[PDB]
């Protein structure tokens, strides 16, 4: 029931010929609605969800101008970070940024986030009060001092408590048929003989939203954790998620095994068995 | 909507 909006920026320098690439993607919970890629022929902010397509040309130009400025500022930030961490024109380097709002009970801000990384590692994060920073080291302390003096925290807080909360609510209303709708997993247990004495039982969970799900096997009410083959939750490519869990069992002993599914879209947690 | 630009300079890292 709790909702969130997230923006993910990826800024990458090129050792070879070309300008650093800036890519921004926006998400409402597990749904990507927007993208911007500077590497494109003519860089433009684009819709990735049908419900954002109702926004006028002023919304898109406002987005495009924010991202084109961030692209230029990131190329300077990349040039800077390799000056802090004394690096070279030699390698390719990545600045990643994740920020956004969590919707609270009274409709206000529950929590605001702003986290930055350099080369896959934590660099600087905005604290819970939204007035202080936490630098993972010294030199990200250089970034910190530059940001404390330029009152960056106050600018972030204004957006997080303000516009971020207001825009998320608009999206939630505009795409309520999907964003506020939890999709239950379409479940089945498939049987796959491996030998004359063994068979694979695979429990499938398909077409679910959101991505969070639990899938476990039990043998006579006993958890099969160590003997369970569990793939990571994966996108179907149609906005839903897929997942399966498998157990190798003695042939004929199938009825002893139960598959347990828990998902938001399920009225009750499911108990599944192979249906021969 | 992404974080919009400030009236001043957008501070780099």
């Amino acid at each position: 029931g709790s909702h969130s909006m997230r923006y993910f920026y990826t800024a990458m320098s090129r050792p070879g010929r070309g300008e650093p690439r800036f890519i921004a993607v926006g998400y409402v919970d597990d749904t990507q609605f927007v993208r911007f890629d500077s590497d494109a022929a003519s860089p433009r902010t684009e819709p990735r969800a049908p419900w954002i397509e109702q926004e006028g040309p002023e919304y898109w130009d406002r987005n495009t101008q924010i991202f084109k400025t961030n692209t230029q500022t990131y190329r300077e930030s990349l040039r800077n970070l390799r000056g802090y961490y004394n690096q070279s024109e030699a390698g390719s380097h990545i600045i990643q940024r994740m920020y956004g709002c969590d919707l609270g009970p009274d409709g206000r801000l529950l929590r605001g986030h702003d986290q930055s990384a350099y080369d896959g590692k934590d660099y600087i994060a905005l604290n819970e009060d939204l007035s202080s920073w936490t630098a993972a080291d010294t030199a990200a302390q250089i970034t910190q001092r530059k940001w404390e003096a330029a009152r960056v925290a106050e600018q972030r807080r204004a957006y997080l408590e303000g516009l971020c909360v207001e825009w998320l609510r608009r999206y939630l209303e505009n795409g309520k048929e999907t964003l506020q709708r939890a999709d239950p997993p379409k479940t089945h247990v498939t049987h796959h003989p491996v030998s004359d004495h063994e068979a694979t039982l695979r429990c499938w969970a398909l077409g679910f939203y959101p991505a969070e799900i639990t899938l476990t096997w039990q043998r006579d009410g006993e958890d099969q954790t160590q003997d369970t083959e569990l793939v990571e939750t994966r996108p179907a490519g149609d906005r839903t998620f897929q997942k399966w869990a498998a157990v190798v069992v003695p042939s004929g002993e199938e009825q002893r095994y139960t598959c347990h599914v828990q998902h938001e879209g399920l009225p009750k947690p499911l108990t599944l068995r192979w249906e021969p | 909507l992404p974080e919009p630009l400030p009236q001043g300079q957008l501070t780099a890292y």
Epitope: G162 | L5, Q9, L10
Partner: T-cell receptor
């Protein structure tokens, strides 16, 4: 968006206290306000910037402000009044973004008398 | 801060002039105001960015030009007596509005 300074002209007795009112109207959840001083010279002198989320109410010498986000009022008090306070005082309101407009009130002329 | 010229100007009605305003703080936003008795400061035009210019409260009788990040010029075309005012330009930051000196302009018949 709107900023209102009802008082056109106020007088004050030297060594006494005076309060200048400012009432704003905004649809923004986050914004910031200013108090500017305009002495007879005609220059615009920065006094204070107060962000909407700021709770910490300030005192700076004979100056003290009272931000009440509830009653949408940002009132400026001058204590132990001196002839140097005789100026025009402006209150301003702006949003945090580049697309936003910084807006001023009609001002309030204060005259301090012995 | 903000560098604004000229300080004083006498203009004949129908004449045209351009007020200068420059900031080296690399700010996105630049604003042009006019101050008149009992009206306080009134926004004429503002610029949110280098290629952008948007109307303020009182844009009539004026034109602006945002060339580069530094400059925000205000053009008076066929100056009218109603344009006799004090003009101020501002480029707000995270701290203050950054006002220029002010242009006291008189449009005479």
């Amino acid at each position: 968006q709107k900023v209102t300074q009802a008082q056109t002209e106020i007088s004050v007795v030297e060594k006494e206290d005076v309060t200048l009112d400012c009432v704003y109207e905004t649809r923004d959840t986050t914004y910031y306000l200013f108090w500017y001083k305009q002495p007879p010279s005609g220059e615009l002198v920065f006094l204070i910037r107060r962000n909407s989320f700021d709770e910490q109410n300030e005192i700076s010498g004979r100056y003290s402000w009272n931000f009440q986000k509830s009653t949408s009022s940002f009132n400026f008090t001058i204590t132990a009044s001196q002839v140097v306070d005789s100026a025009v005082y402006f209150c301003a309101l702006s949003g945090f973004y580049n697309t936003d407009k910084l807006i001023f009130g009609t001002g309030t002329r204060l005259q301090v008398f012995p | 801060g903000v560098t604004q010229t000229p300080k004083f100007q006498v203009l004949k009605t129908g004449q045209s002039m351009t007020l200068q305003c420059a900031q080296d703080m690399n700010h996105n936003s630049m604003y042009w105001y006019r101050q008149d008795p009992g009206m306080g400061l009134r926004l004429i035009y503002y610029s949110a960015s280098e290629g952008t210019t948007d109307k303020g409260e009182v844009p009539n009788g004026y034109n602006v030009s945002r060339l580069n990040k530094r400059e925000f010029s205000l053009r008076l075309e066929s100056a009218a007596p109603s344009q006799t005012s004090v003009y101020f330009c501002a480029s707000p930051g995270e701290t203050e509005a950054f006002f220029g000196q002010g242009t006291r302009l008189t449009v005479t018949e």
